[PDB]
Design a protein around this nucleic acid. Structure first.
Length: 155
RNA sequence: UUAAUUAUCUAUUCCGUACUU
RNA sequence: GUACGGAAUAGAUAAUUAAUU
């Protein structure tokens, strides 16, 4: 167990999780709760812009990012401080089609065990070339495999 | 006609963390 | 019962790129 909790102690004990999930764990000790408000949601489906605000007791702060996840993450990170007071897949497809080859293909060969810390290994396939990559999602794994493949097919 | 990328929402499944009964 | 977080599947919306017609 433990005693006399503090916001300085979480940074040494579990800084690996989001400040969103971590800031509410601190809220329970002080009786406060981090309320989340979306300040902004606009832009094209290629480079949009998001804003979050978090409120903990008599204080509130904001954060921003290219996604809903990145904007909420930065805002919780700012509250904690005051409480302490190109596409490789598309580039490869454009080459593979220009070289006269058949369209690229992707297949998973491996996966991690824990679902909360999932990982993937994916193979890229071209008319003569084959390469492998990995990532925290099947979409990220093919992106990594495409990045290594761009070095193989290109000369 | 085909392939690839990105953001948001809803539903389902799995997993992790905190609080509470 | 509540809040936050990741992965997979399905549906809806939107923008972008390449090849072909």
């Amino acid at each position: 167990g433990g005693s006399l909790p503090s916001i300085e102690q979480m940074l040494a004990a579990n800084p690996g999780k989001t400040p969103i999930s971590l800031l509410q764990e601190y809220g329970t000790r002080i009786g406060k709760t981090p309320v989340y408000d979306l300040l902004k949601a606009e832009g094209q489906a290629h480079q949009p812009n998001f804003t979050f605000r978090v409120t903990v007791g008599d204080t509130s702060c904001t954060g921003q990012g290219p996604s809903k996840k990145a904007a909420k993450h930065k805002a919780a990170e700012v509250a904690l401080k005051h409480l302490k007071g190109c596409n490789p897949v598309g580039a490869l497809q454009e080459l593979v089609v220009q070289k006269g080859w058949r369209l690229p293909e992707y297949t998973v060969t491996q996966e991690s065990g824990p679902a909360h810390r999932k990982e993937f290994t994916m193979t890229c396939r071209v008319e003569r070339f084959i390469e492998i990559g990995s990532g925290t999602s099947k979409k990220l794994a093919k992106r990594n495999a495409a990045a290594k493949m761009l070095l193989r097919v290109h000369t």
